[PDB]
Amino acid sequence: DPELRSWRHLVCYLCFYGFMAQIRPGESFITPYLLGPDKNFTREQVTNEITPVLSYSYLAVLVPVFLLTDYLRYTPVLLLQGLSFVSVWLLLLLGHSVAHMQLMELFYSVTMAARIAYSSYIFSLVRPARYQRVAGYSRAAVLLGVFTSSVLGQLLVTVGRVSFSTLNYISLAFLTFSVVLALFLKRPKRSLFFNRDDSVLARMLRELGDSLRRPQLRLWSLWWVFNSAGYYLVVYYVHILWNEVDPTTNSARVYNGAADAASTLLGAITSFAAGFVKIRWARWSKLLIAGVTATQAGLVFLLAHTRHPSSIWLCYAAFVLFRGSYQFLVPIATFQIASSLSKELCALVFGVNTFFATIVKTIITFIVSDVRGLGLPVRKQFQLYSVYFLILSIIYFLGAMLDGLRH
Ligand SMILES: Nc1nc(=O)c2c(CCc3ccc(C(=O)N[C@@H](CCC(=O)O)C(=O)O)cc3)c[nH]c2[nH]1
Known about the structure:
Layout: H1 8-20, H2 31-34, H3 43-50, H4 53-60, H5 62-71, H6 76-94, H7 98-113, H8 116-125, H9 131-159, H10 164-183, H11 200-212, H12 217-226, H13 229-245, H14 256-273, H15 286-304, H16 312-337, H17 343-369, H18 378-402
Helix pairs in contact: 1-9, 3-7, 4-7, 4-17, 5-7, 6-7, 6-10, 9-14, 12-16, 12-17, 13-16, 13-17, 13-18, 14-16, 15-16, 15-18
The ligand Nc1nc(=O)c2c(CCc3ccc(C(=O)N[C@@H](CCC(=O)O)C(=O)O)cc3)c[nH]c2[nH]1 binds near residues 31, 54 and 323.
């Protein structure tokens, strides 16, 4: 039996690791570094040979990491999320070929599949009577981490006047510190699926069938499969589009970290404002999806049809508002799906709704974005993502009227 750690020395260390694991100052400046004068990649080599591997590998490492999170009891996947971080920035700084960058998207996809390895780690580390206070602190330390990583990434690049290569060495110093902090995390002794002391498969699938016939779980899983697949396709490719609108030689004029800190801050407000409307706007739920996906159709169209370099600040605001539109509906989706679900069925449905959204993200990425598919440039393929949300916002508006006229 291992010694119980001090309680105030654990929540302070869960919040300090969860803050320091999000410090990647050169993360918003990966694409202006790859497309810059430091890396020798063509604009069509990044958007068609490199960036679709971020979607392919995330389909390949999604299942494995989702199962190894519960099998290894959530600590070596927090180390694998930090060591694949080091392997991304070791390939940013030392990789030169296109295959070295497709390997970098293989290691970045491990860090995206192991993003739930920290929210589900505190779920199994902390007793349920004490969980909602630590999960409130650690979600505030993660959100403070991804905010100030983009602020420190911006102040070093704009105010500090450091290069993108020096910023990736500052990021590699913060990332080897996050591997050291992940070593001293307290590994749990019982997980949710594979390391409990006991079937679970029988309890879930008997409850999954009865909870699949709810018209709030099906509606917000259909949102999670399709509206979140189009969201990350805009998120992966908007920095390639900002390198087309404002191709500035100076790194201090980039402001990619100022737009990924504003969309973190605006995404925090819309996630806070969604806690007040997740239970009461459940009636007008298809109209809330169609009202936001129509806004997400206009902002991608506004991104796809700005070509003047002085209107790059409109392209930053059309993405901060784009992220804030999606982060408004995620706490509403998280509640309407997981309302009457078991905690083992929350991790199964959200693990499947992420997996089905990654299949849709892989199918579009291969057809629209890959050089083996259509090979479209970032500006033309942002016009197909604009009519992707418009087709989605038509279906949820027709679904709000084909079921709004029944009474
Ligand atoms: N060439 C190239 N360009 C890139 O942009 C890139 C990246 C970043 C891709 C990436 C960025 C954010 C999220 C994501 O899921 N974002 C989260 C959190 C972000 C935050 O909090 O700031 C979200 O849900 O918004 C998912 C994926 C890795 N390798 C790359 N290679």
